[PDB]
Symmetry: D2
Subunit: 111 residues, 4 copies
Amino acid sequence: CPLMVKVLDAVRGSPAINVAVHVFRKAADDTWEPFASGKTSESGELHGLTTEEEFVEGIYKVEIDTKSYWKALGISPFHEHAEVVFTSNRRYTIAALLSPYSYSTTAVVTN
Amino acid sequence: CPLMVKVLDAVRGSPAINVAVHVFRKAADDTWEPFASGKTSESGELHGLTTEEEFVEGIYKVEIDTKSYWKALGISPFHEHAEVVFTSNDSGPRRYTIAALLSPYSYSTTAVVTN
Amino acid sequence: CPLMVKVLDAVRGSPAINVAVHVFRKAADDTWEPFASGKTSESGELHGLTTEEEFVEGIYKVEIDTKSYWKALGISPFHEHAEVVFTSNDSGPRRYTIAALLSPYSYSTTAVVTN
Amino acid sequence: CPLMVKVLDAVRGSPAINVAVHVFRKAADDTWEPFASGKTSESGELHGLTTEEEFVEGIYKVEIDTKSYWKALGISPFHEHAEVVFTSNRRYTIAALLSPYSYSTTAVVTN
């Protein structure tokens, strides 16, 4: 699998568990087509979203459902979600670090 | 003006100058409709995007064109742009500052919501 | 004043108000000697720490007392404080803004160096 | 080993390799005593700094030598180093994300 998502909780200093993630790919008509989805495990990681065969070149959007994560913990956060948009032309790790009013995201791209 | 955008460059240690910013509001049909736009100033800030009259409660998307910023510096970036999506709330007086800190393969964003 | 400190709270989405900040300069014997101190204002900023006359080239440490900030909010934090250590440089006119974004188990800091 | 350090490079989107790390522990005389040191591997991680037996309660400082990292890559960075100071009373991962004029650090504390 060439695409992994990892999410951390900056309030607790812990993996962000059970975070829903939806991946979209831009279609030829310039609309966002559903591509894959899943949720983070107890380690805060989401593996197996796709395969090398399926993950063709394109423009991808990884939507991390941060609002649902915070609301399930009893917190009213600022953002609806965190959206990570990039073109793929190799392994991509999309990492996110979450706080109620702030997030950071980094891409680690390796061979 | 109830909405301000501030952008910093973590590679140069500077304001991110002349970054394009496009703001959208979610319409009744669930599509994003254009709302306001501009480019950050010499201080990395974008003021005057809207007014209290127009900035009614809704879901807003602030799109920061990070890819073009890095390409103008001759630097290869990862993301197409940075998007900040939030619901505004009129529970009392409120100003929203959307702050972003940019690196080629990483960004952070924070909301500073004050009275 | 060539040195400003700005602190934001990523949990509340607000300036970090009344945060203690202590600045030190490295002495000739390699110890940290006190240089300036204060507390952030209602805007999360600390102005007037020093003057161009006193802020000569050297190695400076800016210590931000994050632990006491979180404890005053009733929130359990990880770090004792956040420290920012850098060498100043008089190559032309220069102002340093040390910005910090705080969460209980994480922080980021950026230097904005302008003319 | 109860203490791991992980470093990422936000310019390249890669692990930060060969980053020197020095850990200190506050002694009874309130001075910083050397505790352990090492450097990050090709994965950006530093394992085996200490043992459960050696890592007693105390105040620890993890100094990540960011200036030497950037200078070895031909870049003049802002900070001398990144310093992470915390009290230990369990596994600690100290993560850092580096840019020439900025860094972020997070603690992930697990059982």
